[PDB]
Amino acid sequence: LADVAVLYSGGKDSNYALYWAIKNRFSVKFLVTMVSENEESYMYHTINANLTDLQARALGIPLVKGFTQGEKEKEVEDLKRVLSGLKIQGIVAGALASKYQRKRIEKVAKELGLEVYTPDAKEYMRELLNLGFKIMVVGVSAYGLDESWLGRILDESALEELITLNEKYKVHVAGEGGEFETFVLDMPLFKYKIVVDKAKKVWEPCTSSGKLIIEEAHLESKL
Amino acid sequence: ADVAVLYSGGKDSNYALYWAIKNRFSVKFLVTMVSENEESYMYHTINANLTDLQARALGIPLVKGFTQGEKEKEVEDLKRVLSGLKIQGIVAGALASKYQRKRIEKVAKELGLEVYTPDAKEYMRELLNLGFKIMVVGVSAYGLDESWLGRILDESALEELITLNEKYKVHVAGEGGEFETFVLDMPLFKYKIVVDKAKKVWEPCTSSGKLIIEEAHLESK
Ligand SMILES: Nc1ncnc2c1ncn2[C@@H]1O[C@H](COP(=O)(O)OP(=O)(O)OP(=O)(O)O)[C@@H](O)[C@H]1O
Ligand SMILES: Nc1ncnc2c1ncn2[C@@H]1O[C@H](COP(=O)(O)OP(=O)(O)OP(=O)(O)O)[C@@H](O)[C@H]1O
Structure with a gap:
């Protein structure tokens, strides 16, 4: 069980x-x-x-x-x-x-x-x-999350920005409303770390949303 | 079952x-x-x-x-x-x-x-x-050069393999790692695969090589 x-x-x-x-x-x-x-x-x-x-x-x-x-x-x-x-x-x-x-x-x-x-x-x-x-932001779809957020790694400073956007535009801190999407590059359980070697962001001004397409990445030892 | x-x-x-x-x-x-x-x-x-x-x-x-x-x-x-x-x-x-x-x-x-x-x-x-x-994506046997990388194994290619089997004893089926392949299409496949980008990597030290398929997509059939 x-x-x-x-x-x-x-x-x-x-x-x-x-x-x-x-x-x-x-x-x-x-x-x-x-x-x-x-x-x-x-x-x-x-x-x-x-x-x-x-x-x-x-x-x-x-x-x-x-x-x-x-x-x-x-x-x-x-x-x-x-x-x-x-x-x-x-x-x-x-x-x-x-x-x-x-x-x-x-x-x-x-x-x-x-x-x-x-x-x-x-x-x-x-x-x-x-x-x-x-955690790397790979998608954004909410006012306050401009294209610059695409590909950014969410640290404490980043989290503080999200806090500000939450107060100003009601952006859910953890993207509960689907404000943004993420991809985990590393975590203590990962034996290796994921390193993005090449990527491109696709943006759509018609709805002011976009994504970070990772098109090349490898793993690196952790020790 | x-x-x-x-x-x-x-x-x-x-x-x-x-x-x-x-x-x-x-x-x-x-x-x-x-x-x-x-x-x-x-x-x-x-x-x-x-x-x-x-x-x-x-x-x-x-x-x-x-x-x-x-x-x-x-x-x-x-x-x-x-x-x-x-x-x-x-x-x-x-x-x-x-x-x-x-x-x-x-x-x-x-x-x-x-x-x-x-x-x-x-x-x-x-x-x-x-x-x-069938596409050849890897070779490792005297007689098989880099020209085989990316090649589609059709009847014409098979005969060449048979020839090489006569000349250098290359295995027609590729057993023992003589060559590796990648199937792009088959009857059971609902779609066919098309290679959009590939990199040929040749190892002069062992006179062998491989084809790294970088980009590919499914196409109707
Ligand atoms: N493609 C999928 N395949 C399998 N499980 C999925 C898939 N998408 C979501 N899930 C599971 O359902 C949950 C709900 O995912 P949801 O659509 O709400 O987005 P999410 O919470 O941002 O996804 P993630 O867990 O990757 O952060 C996830 O936590 C996960 O366990
Ligand atoms: N990476 C692998 N994962 C799972 N099974 C494998 C793997 N490599 C080989 N096998 C199994 O062992 C067999 C022998 O491998 P082999 O390389 O000779 O043939 P193949 O990979 O099927 O075709 P080819 O050699 O033409 O690329 C395969 O037929 C398959 O069943």
Whole structure:
């Protein structure tokens, strides 16, 4: 019952769920990433869904990639199929999920007889920084988050800026409202560190939003 | 019934999959090992991280396991990645070397899993007849120059291999690491792969080389 699988999307919440699972002495048998063909997927994220391989390699944990069209409800089922093929007793995911996701996750879990573990934005983000998380902003979609944020690493100064934007424009500290997206380059659990060698940011002025596409990165020893 | 196919992305891996499907096996997973040991006698390493693109074309879940390449960790690292799968057996390419076969049979036996394994000139001609679109991404044998990197293995190319087999004894099927390949298209593939950017890296010190596929995308068919 300690054998679990963590739904991993590469961001700060997925990596914290993983941190959490291991710290609570759970046995994360697999990292599971769903690769949706549809960009507007309601269940899964597409951002850096191809870079998870790097994090999995840095972690040493087996990675399971499932491929789906990303259609409304057909998605939950696709996950179900992938999960039923794994020898696990439970599944972990980031607590920042939504009632829509949370509900559907719990649904498939009950259909497979699996437990569902889901572990203040300010104390949260600060906790991640104190745990050694190296979070890089790879997406922005909210007034106050200009293109300059793309690719920036979230430290204490950065967090203080977000605080200011929160007071001025109601920007959620931890991006709970989807103000920005992230990708974890390093964390104490990573055996190696992810180093971005080349990347480009795609910007859309029609909605004043953008993303940092990492198109070249490697791993570096940590000792 | 339920099995996992050891998939490296090469011709033999792809034929193992084709073989398993046609023989009424239920391919629940494709398993790709990623090793840091560029010169391992266990796994094909060139473009090892490209299987994701093929798996996406097939519509079959992929399991990526990792290993530093230490020969003393070959069995335990592969075992770690298979032990957690609800499978009754595993499929391996029919051309797996003895060095490989032993390791595979050991890990299988330790997991209680079965091992399913499917004339070089005949074997190759069949793959072409089956519609396999094979690109050479690595070579290492006297007689094989850099011109082979990136080349598409068609009937014309096969005859050249047969010729080289006569002249320098090069293995027509590439066993023993003589050459490595990458399957761009196959019948089971829903989409075909197209290479958009690649880098040829030649090793003069051993007169060998490899093609690093840098960019690629799926195209309709
Ligand atoms: N593509 C995906 N594949 C598998 N699990 C996913 C995927 N996307 C999200 N999840 C899981 O569901 C949770 C909710 O993700 P959500 O869409 O809210 O974005 P997020 O919280 O920013 O993602 P991340 O955990 O990477 O930070 C994640 O914490 C993770 O466990
Ligand atoms: N990285 C790997 N991960 C999982 N299985 C592998 C890996 N490398 C080899 N194998 C398995 O062992 C067999 C032998 O590998 P080999 O390199 O000879 O063939 P291949 O990779 O399938 O095709 P080719 O040699 O033409 O590139 C494969 O058929 C496959 O089943």
